[PDB]
Symmetry: C2
Subunit: 133 residues, 2 copies
């Protein structure tokens, strides 16, 4: 961490981002970002932000340097000291977040999916693997 | 064989996650995406790992007739060993992922929207089928 998977050909409907790792014992929060470029502060088609400290999972986007309106999933299917598996699945309509074996949240596209060019995973997380199919 | 009806209408972004164990004496097993619950319904995707000949056969079926086979490289399964398969529907075909790698891309031969059922059979101990 901070992880960085470049996506020069972008991502299309039917793309699966598979993220496996450990939330370490003193973790505050971590994030998975689908970014439109490599510059610092690049627009984000999806910002996925489990907050162990506040017991929420936040979803948002960023454009022109300005954040959108946050969406929240139900509860927090993550725990300090426990490993996790997250799927982020691109459809034509948005991103499906799967945590464990349960569909967790659907985030409607706000930026065109064709803008995505990079996946960034950072924060308080010890990554096992990041794979993009 | 195991059968699971599709829950929300297949589309680009539908992911089938299949977990299971290949028995020590396995010859082959298959995952079929079928267009109906009739026996004899078209198969938009037939995914057929062959432990015997160490290949993976891909095919479709239409009106009782099998299509052109796509026999891919090696078998990413082992007798006595567990597995996790993802079948991912995209606009252009089905991504078949096993373990940590996309094994093959099977271009759509039938309209994706005709798929209504997943079937899992052959020499396989099926742990779970999930549709996401």
């Amino acid at each position: 961490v901070p992880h960085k998977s470049s996506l020069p050909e972008g991502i299309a409907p039917g793309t699966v981002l598979r993220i496996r790792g450990l939330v370490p014992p003193n973790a505050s929060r971590f994030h998975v970002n689908l970014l439109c470029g490599e510059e610092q502060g690049s627009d984000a088609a999806l910002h996925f932000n489990p907050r162990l400290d506040t017991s929420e999972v936040v979803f948002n986007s960023k454009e022109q340097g300005s954040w959108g309106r946050e969406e929240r999933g139900p509860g927090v299917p993550f725990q300090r000291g426990q490993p996790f598996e997250v799927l982020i699945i691109a459809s034509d309509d948005g991103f499906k977040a799967v945590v464990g074996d349960a569909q967790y949240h659907h985030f409607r596209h706000r930026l065109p999916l064709a803008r995505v060019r990079l996946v960034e995973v950072g924060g308080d997380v010890q990554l096992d693997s990041v794979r993009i199919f």
